Amino acid sequence: AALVIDNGSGMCKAGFAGDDAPRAVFPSIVGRPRHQGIMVGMGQKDSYVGDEAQSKRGILTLRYPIEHGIVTNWDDMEKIWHHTFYNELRVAPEEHPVLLTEAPMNPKSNREKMTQIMFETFNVPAFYVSIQAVLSLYSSGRTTGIVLDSGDGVTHVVPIYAGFSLPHAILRIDLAGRDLTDYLMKILSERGYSFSTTAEREIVRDIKEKLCYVALDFEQEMQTAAQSSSIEKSYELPDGQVITIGNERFRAPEALFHPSVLGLESAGIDQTTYNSIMKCDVDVRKELYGNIVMSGGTTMFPGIAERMQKEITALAPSSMKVKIIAPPERKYSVWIGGSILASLTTFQQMWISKQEYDESGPSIV
Amino acid sequence: AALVIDNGSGMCKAGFAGDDAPRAVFPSIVGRPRHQGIMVGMGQKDSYVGDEAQSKRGILTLRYPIEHGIVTNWDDMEKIWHHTFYNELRVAPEEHPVLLTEAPMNPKSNREKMTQIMFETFNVPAFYVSIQAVLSLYSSGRTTGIVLDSGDGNTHVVPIYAGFSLPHAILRIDLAGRDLTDYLMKILSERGYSFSTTAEREIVRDIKEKLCYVALDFEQEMQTAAQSSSIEKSYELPDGQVITIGNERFRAPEALFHPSVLGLESAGIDQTTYNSIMKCDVDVRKELYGNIVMSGGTTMFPGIAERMQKEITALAPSSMKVKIIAPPERKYSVWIGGSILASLTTFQQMWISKQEYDESGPSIV
Amino acid sequence: TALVCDNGSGLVKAGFAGDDAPRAVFPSIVGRPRHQGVMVGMGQKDSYVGDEAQSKRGILTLKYPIEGIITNWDDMEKIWHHTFYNELRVAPEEHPTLLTEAPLNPKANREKMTQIMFETFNVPAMYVAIQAVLSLYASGRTTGIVLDSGDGVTHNVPIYEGYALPHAIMRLDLAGRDLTDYLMKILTERGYSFVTTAEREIVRDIKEKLCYVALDFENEMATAASSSSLEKSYELPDGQVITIGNERFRCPETLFQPSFIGMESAGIHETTYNSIMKCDIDIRKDLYANNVMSGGTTMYPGIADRMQKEITALAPSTMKIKIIAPPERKYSVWIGGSILASLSTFQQMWITKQEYDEAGPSIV
What we know:
The PDB classes it as contractile protein/structural protein. Keywords: actin filament, actin, acromsomal bundle, structural protein, contractile protein-structural protein complex. Actin filament model in the extended form of acromsomal bundle in the Limulus sperm. The structure is cut from a larger assembly and holds chains A (365 residues), B (365 residues) and C (364 residues). With 365 residues, chain A is an alpha+beta fold. Chain A has helices at residues 51-55, 74-89, 108-119, 132-138, 177-189, 198-211, 218-227, 248-251, 269-279, 282-289, 304-315, 333-343, 354-360; strands spanning 3-6, 11-16, 24-27, 30-33, 48-49, 60-63, 66-67, 70-71, 98-102, 126-131, 145-150, 155-161, 164-165, 171-172, 233-236, 242-245, 292-295, 324-325, 352-353. Chain A is built from 13 helices and 19 strands. Chain A has a six-stranded mixed sheet with strand order 3-2-1-9-10-19, sandwiched between helices. In chain A, helix 4 (132-138) packs across helix 12 (333-343), helix 5 packs across helix 6 (198-211) and helix 9 (269-279) crosses helix 11 (304-315). Chain B has helices at residues 51-55, 74-89, 108-122, 132-138, 177-191, 198-208, 218-225, 248-251, 269-278, 285-290, 304-314, 333-343, 354-360; strands at 3-6, 11-16, 24-27, 30-33, 48-49, 60-63, 66-67, 70-71, 97-102, 126-131, 145-150, 155-161, 164-165, 171-173, 233-236, 242-245, 292-295, 324-325, 352-353. Chain B starts with a strand and ends in a 5-residue tail after the last helix. Chain C has twelve helices and 17 strands. The chains are: A alpha+beta (365), B alpha+beta (365), C alpha+beta (364). Chains in contact: A-B, A-C, B-C.
């Protein structure tokens, strides 16, 4: 059996080939103690990965190697994996084939470097790197799909025609679940809240994930909150103190369609779907309009699939089969893309072998 | 039973002998990959043909290997026949007498090329190649008749007498079904459309194929377009936006009679129909006048039979029997004519046999 | 003095007669507000215009009024209503204005161009002028086929006796926008970000700065894949020094083999042979010898050496190939206007305010 580790800008996702749910779902953080000690409590282990590092904000300095799918730092990424093998998945890398994810439009040098580390500091028998949305497309039951990922870091739209991604339309807004929380932290503080700590960033993250939704129309909904507390939803903080969130609740996800609310003056995910599809050829486009597949955690907000269905019905040809297929499991579909792909008896011949690596080297990827 | 395959320069038509209507009708395109993959979707078949290729021209390269009824690229042609057997008609060539076409006055090197590729690759027990226009006349029910075979690529006028195409009179105009469309694509962008992809041009093609017609007088019609919305025809695009096509509808048909609109200083089809009768002997001419047969997909324009009937009686004085027969099946008469010709109990002795091929070589024609 | 304005979808350039270099230059773009949005310092403006529309895009969405050819008039009017006012600080009422059109500019839109100029503007005299004729004029040539290429436009125009043969003009829609989106595939496939409209604004520039054609396709395909020469570093306007390489040839080679996107059009060398092959026989002599290029997308280093070879391969070898490349070229249609507006014989050629009154839009 093989291994699959989705290296997410917020949450990394490890496991084996064949399983349905990701075996090690964890924050992609490496944490290093600011002054390293002799003992327990004091800050003893040279780097901490996942939720331990995160609890231990008192002792550590927290670092995320992967920003917008682009792995920026390889010393933190590697040291994650030393822990993904020996501490998370509780395996020995040299025994199991590995599939790791990479962004839609991810660096060749970053690919070629990941290629290096895996067969080398980890000696894994076999490896393959795979483009995030294309793997969501595999978990969507397709060969053809305009797939739109929004993870914690990156938000990429891809026209998959017959398994081939068409790069000449692969689009993006650098706006995702992390930028989304920061918006809600602002607009609660502007409601009058003091939310400032990273702990209260997790408060503002939780509120985002549970109470934030995408209005079917933005302006209408605003005055709907103005006229009714319908929208207003209570929240029990770790204080026990109940707060109330109101028109914030739909303003926060609406970054994704109206990005410019953060000051991030891009076109919205609606617009970028359309603009990906036009940059394709016309028969591709037909099935892209019918095979708009959503992916990521930030694709989860209430109303988003219906809203995308609304907007793209107007933006696409009136007589077209517009069809969103929003995955229920979409915070993980990229790992479910990996695990199926690794388990594919066909795909067994598509792995990078240890042989081709030692005869040809990292440049074959 | 035998087979018949009218290799149209845009639409090829195939089937068994003695069927009334064509069993395999498809575009003549073979597509190769840009770079083939190995798996599902990604380029697994070295050569996708006809309708299949069309859907997949994203990942492929297409070429339409047949110009003015004459095959330019015999690689693609061999592959097209290989298609119609195994994929379309779902048969094995070696079981089959085959009849294929060649355009009026098609060259014998080209003929002989085809003549071979049957009996050495496809090893068919019998074969024949037939002159499109004479086959139309057969399917008309005449010995004698001046045929205008006007289709996607070629427009050819042929005076048949007693079952003989008079080769010296076969007159030719080089604008036809595609030259017509691409003119209409400009004249649609002159009104204000932005049809520029191949499938934005499939729109243009199907507009010509649905709303267009040949005016009886070009002036009265131009003026009537500029007044009353009877000439105006609305069209539901594969956009669903209904648009309206007006004075374009006939001014693109008027290219065939005044090729000068393209800048093609060639005599109108009417004039050529007249002139071809004038390029034959005096006595037989009145029969050619009484039996002008239109074949081809392009003479399936509305108004066109009526119009040629107007113009040849006005390009004569008045009294003489001019007569256009443009059959309701004229896109396919060449096929139905091969069907009959192959089914002829008499004409069984006129097949090119697999035996006489191997004894006497492809030049026997 | 007169006023002169080269309207492109990329850049609109203005100024006066007599000056050698364009007085105004701006992107052709306005923004109309997705919310009521006080840019604290101005009042509630209708439209932020050009390098203003994109400055504040978050409030107000970018459109291009004229994709070489005029579509939308509410944006369009704000562009003529930028250039006089903010850009030149001049009043329309005062100044005989000349405006351009990309070659093959149609009946209906020019009628309304002429209308608006005399009404909401009141200009004392206006003249629209066909971009490629003005290029050849600014060149100092009587005759010769011209090739405009731009962000939205490309054009082959046979000029004789100061006159374009209209019928023989080809526009190529595959222009510099297509090219910048293509570069924007490829760097992204190497792994850079480059795909928001902000990063279009970057990837336009990088191309303009570093992207060349090279004389042979096969040999340059060899160098690209094998040698560390292709790479050039570049700070984009955040700070990330990237490395562009290969694409520098693998983008503008689309003007020569448009198939690179899957658009199948004949390459410029083909279109130019065929545009001259929309003209006669021996009369073709110094069309082949006075072949002028124009616009934005003609800046690419390598194209001329390439094109001369590729046009000569197509053609009966005795034709004297002489293709001219000025260094000012984004402005050649402005400098075809200004000096030709200053030229005295032209006072009679303008469309006056008076003649408009009697003739209506129908004088354009």
